[PDB]
Ligand SMILES: Nc1ncnc2c1ncn2[C@@H]1O[C@H](COP(=O)(O)OP(=O)(O)OP(=O)(O)O)[C@@H](O)[C@H]1O
Ligand SMILES: Nc1ncnc2c1ncn2[C@@H]1O[C@H](COP(=O)(O)OP(=O)(O)O)[C@@H](O)[C@H]1O
Ligand SMILES: Cc1cn([C@H]2C[C@H](O)[C@@H](COP(=O)(O)O)O2)c(=O)[nH]c1=O
Ligand SMILES: [Mg+2]
Ligand SMILES: [Mg+2]
Ligand SMILES: [Mg+2]
């Protein structure tokens with residue numbers, strides 16, 4: 083059965099911090115956990131490709147999608163099948179926010195690509211660490227871009243209000259962790 | 272104006288040879304020409320990575336699509352915009368034949384991915400160099416290659432106004448002369 087959880091937010095919003103704290107927290111409860119990440123959980127060498135100068139946004143998304151396809155097939159679905167809690171530090175929503183709202187690619191196309199790439203796999207909960215855009219720190223990742231991405235993430239959360247849990251990324255680390263834990267307690271068990 | 276042409280077929284069907292001969296013919300006529308190829312015309316690192324990695328068909332297609340997206344935008348469209356005849360040794364049909372018919376991915380999905388990746392750019396003519404896998408120059412493993420060969424033939428019979436199918440086992444010069452005869456009305 084398993085449980086699929088993701089962390090999302092701008093660069094520097096505390097995703098990795100919270101994903102790792104959550105993994106350790108759940109491991110301490112005796113739960114089998116698999117901690118993974120994008121980009122690179124599927125095809126580690128995609129990280130080299132993604133640094134290529136002057137990439138079209140289309141090519142950028144297609145690279146993230148290639149990694150995502152491998153990631154879902156070889157890592158996430160097998161983890162879930164073994165009954166693990168699988169936590170991914172970034173997932174599809176990162177592409178929707180960055181390549182969609184940030185770069186301007188059409189969301190329906192992103193979703194059509196993803197439908198095969200992800201085999202339709204959706205997280206049960208997505209913890210969005212909402213960070214002011216000026217605090218964030220690929221090419222052209224400036225303030226205008228980060229404002230679009232930040233608001234994009236908030237739009238995705240309003241559209242799927244049961245899946246997304248929106249948290250103020252500027253709260254103390256331990257307060258955010260307790261909030262994440264509270265949202266999880268009824269799901270585990 | 273610009274004119275976009277592609278060559279397709281199995282590895283060892285004579286694509287590079289005929290692409291070279293076609294560009295030479297065009298050069299002899301004083302017609303500006305650009306020769307290119309996939310994979311690697313957009314992102315060389317995709318070609319070299321996939322030399323030594325086995326991926327799911329979906330991931331493979333998506334990497335080839337990233338390459339193609341760069342190839343179209345950075346190489347092909349600018350060549351066409353300059354009025355060149357651009358000849359690509361492999362294009363979208365390669366992914367449809369290999370990842371679609373060969374490895375089983377659904378063609379409508381492949382085509383929806385490609386719609387943005389290629390900006391809808393389609394060749395005016397595609398020369399398919401057809402031969403059985405056992406005739407490609409340079410039991411159970413041959414099944415994949417027969418799916419690809421048959422897939423190419425399926426693509427060709429669906430778009431007879433775009434594909435020209437040639438017997439790849441003919442002598443080189445004769446194939447080249449056939450390509451020239453098909454191309455002459457379009458210059
Ligand atoms: N709640 C917080 N308050 C203040 N600083 C934090 C908080 N959480 C994490 N940090 C610090 O912010 C920085 C970025 O955190 P982290 O690497 O977890 O973010 P991220 O979202 O994973 O970034 P990236 O997108 O670059 O991977 C680190 O220096 C980290 O210690
Ligand atoms: N019509 C032909 N007859 C005989 N040999 C050929 C012919 N066309 C190409 N060759 C030779 O066959 C091999 C494969 O040709 P090549 O153009 O590299 O095919 P591809 O690019 O499709 O793999 C090369 O060694 C080439 O010299
Ligand atoms: C997973 C993913 C990340 N990104 C960006 C966020 C970061 O700037 C960069 C790498 O992610 P990371 O810094 O969290 O490892 O890639 C996208 O633009 N789209 C995606 O789909
Ligand atoms: Mg954020
Ligand atoms: Mg991080
Ligand atoms: Mg995707």
Ligand SMILES: [Mg+2]
Nearest residue numbers: 088173174175
């Ligand atoms: Mg997510």
Ligand SMILES: [Mg+2]
Nearest residue numbers: 280281282416
């Ligand atoms: Mg072959």
Ligand SMILES: [Mg+2]
Nearest residue numbers: 286287288360
């Ligand atoms: Mg060749």
Ligand SMILES: [Mg+2]
Nearest residue numbers: 336339385388
């Ligand atoms: Mg494509």
